[PDB]
Design a protein around this nucleic acid. Sequence first.
DNA 1: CGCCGCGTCAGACTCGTAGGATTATAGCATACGTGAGGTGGGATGTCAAGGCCTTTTTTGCCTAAAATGTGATCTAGATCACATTTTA
Length: 79
Amino acid sequence: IETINKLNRISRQMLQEMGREPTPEELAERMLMPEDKIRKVLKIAKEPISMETPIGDDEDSHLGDFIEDTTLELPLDSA
DNA sequence: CGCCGCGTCAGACTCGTAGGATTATAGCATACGTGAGGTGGGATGTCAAGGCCTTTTTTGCCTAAAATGTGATCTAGATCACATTTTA
């Protein structure tokens, strides 16, 4: 959490300075820690996106309908 | 008794189209456990030569014994130009 705070606060100032966003190269430099941890945390920062959202813009497809289950078996494999 | 206000509750059906989110939240110190790493060590699994038995491959061998050789003495087939001679 603390690492994320420092990141997203510094990215604003880097946005002022550059006029653009920072890269994990430039930001791993500014963040004092190597690119592995940066990239890692960037991979961690994502949330879930709520199956009951309407990916059909019309009330046709709540996202859960789209989802496949690849867990059970296929009858051809059984045979 | 008979309004009136407020609130509850349905609004056809099968296909297709697209990807998709966002704000800001302090900071460092203590101390404890769990994940990724070492590490000898039973124990399991493998691979190359040897002793029990039967079968198989050579291989003795065992005697019936029928077969393989000895060669001078024959024999019953086999020929060819001429002289007819028969048959369709």
